[PDB]
Design a protein around this ligand. Sequence first.
Ligand SMILES: Cn1ncc2ccc(CN3C[C@@H](C(N)=O)CCC3=O)cc21
Ligand SMILES: [Zn+2]
Length: 140
Amino acid sequence: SGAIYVGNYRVVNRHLATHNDWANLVWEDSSRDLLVSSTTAQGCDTIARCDCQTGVYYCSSRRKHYPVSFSKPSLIFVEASEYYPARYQSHLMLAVGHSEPGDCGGILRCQHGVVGIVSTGGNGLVGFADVRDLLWLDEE
Ligand SMILES: Cn1ncc2ccc(CN3C[C@@H](C(N)=O)CCC3=O)cc21
Ligand SMILES: [Zn+2]
């Protein structure tokens, strides 16, 4: 579990969005496993606007923050799960690291701010849904 709070927006994994998130929906994309909803309170996170490929992510299954190298956002095939059938997920970045399904929502960050959230994994590879291209998150 986990979310990004920037301005009057909440960014979560689409498969973990609540009824309030869908009722207050701003934007969602199944192929990215992302959903953004509106909030009443101002958020404190800053989205990174960069092409960093090094950062740190939080892994709830280890209660640890791991420094990683990660790939550029790309279209990657993702196996079937209880949430989606087998499909290609876009804007996904992989790193060599530990993750389990419940780790989705854990933030990946670089020196410039929030890069993305854990969304996929397995076989010692963790996958993050990129958010750096969503420039509108920085303005109302
Ligand atoms: C985060 N993580 N670490 C290992 C691992 C193994 C399997 C899965 C399966 N999965 C894929 C997600 C998607 N973005 O398609 C949806 C939710 C989900 O349970 C995730 C995993
Ligand atoms: Zn950066």
